[PDB]
Amino acid sequence: ATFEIVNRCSYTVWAAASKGDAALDAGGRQLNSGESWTINVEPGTNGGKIWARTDCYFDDSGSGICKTGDCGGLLRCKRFGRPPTTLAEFSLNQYGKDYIDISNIKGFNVPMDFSPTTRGCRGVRCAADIVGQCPAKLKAPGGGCNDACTVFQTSEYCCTTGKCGPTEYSRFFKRLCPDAFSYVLDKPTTVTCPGSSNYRVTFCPTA
Numbered sequence: 001a002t003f004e005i006v007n008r009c010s011y012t013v014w015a016a017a018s019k020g021d022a023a024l025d026a027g028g029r030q031l032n033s034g035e036s037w038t039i040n041v042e043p044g045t046n047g048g049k050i051w052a053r054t055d056c057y058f059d060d061s062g063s064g065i066c067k068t069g070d071c072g073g074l075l076r077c078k079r080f081g082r083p084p085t086t087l088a089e090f091s092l093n094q095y096g097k098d099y100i101d102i103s104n105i106k107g108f109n110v111p112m113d114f115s116p117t118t119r120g121c122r123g124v125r126c127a128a129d130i131v132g133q134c135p136a137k138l139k140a141p142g143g144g145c146n147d148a149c150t151v152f153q154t155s156e157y158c159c160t161t162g163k164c165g166p167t168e169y170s171r172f173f174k175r176l177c178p179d180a181f182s183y184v185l186d187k188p189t190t191v192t193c194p195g196s197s198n199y200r201v202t203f204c205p206t207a
């Protein structure tokens, strides 16, 4: 499957793509404002994620740090990134269909649209100014809006036992972005797409 990753933000982002225990494609790349990077994701990839990283420094070996979404200091991510990270999440070719969503469960850093480029399903978007509106107690200095689990490490925010409800913090993410997961047991906003669909992830879709 191809994912066209487009940075419409006015600032550079460092895109990242991983399934947690491995890179997808090269795993990461710099996208200046307006740039597009098309990656190949193997069919059957389960639990893949794409995200943006902001304010990164990398040396000539591809090692450094990002203020948001750092993946163990690598340009080419092999693992998931440090919250806060808005997540484009996908599982492909799962019994004939693909499944996509956006999630704020690991916080929010950059607004994103995640849509199919092929027929048969809708896209999802979280484009609101979550960083600007972020509750004070969730604000990340280096940028972004942390999820409550990251900040407070309670069973209720982290849904540790598989039993948890919505919270004042989850409801903030949900209010700003109804079509993204706001906590672990949120009413799902996963979209079913035809198996082997192709996609576009756009950062800053409205600006």
Ligand SMILES: O=C(O)c1cccc(C(=O)O)n1
Pocket (backbone or CB within 6 Å): 072
């Ligand atoms: O490599 C990492 O990110 C790491 C390693 C050990 C513990 C933790 C953790 O508890 O977050 N994270």
Ligand SMILES: O=C(O)c1cccc(C(=O)O)n1
Pocket (backbone or CB within 6 Å): 070, 071, 072, 079, 080, 081, 082, 083
């Ligand atoms: O298991 C973990 O602790 C973990 C996994 C992916 C990324 C990170 C991180 O960036 O801290 N930590």
Ligand SMILES: O=C(O)c1cccc(C(=O)O)n1
Pocket (backbone or CB within 6 Å): 082, 083, 150
């Ligand atoms: O030091 C770390 O590895 C760390 C710190 C904050 C969050 C996380 C995480 O979400 O894994 N990991």
Ligand SMILES: [Eu+2]
Pocket (backbone or CB within 6 Å): none
């Ligand atoms: Eu960690």
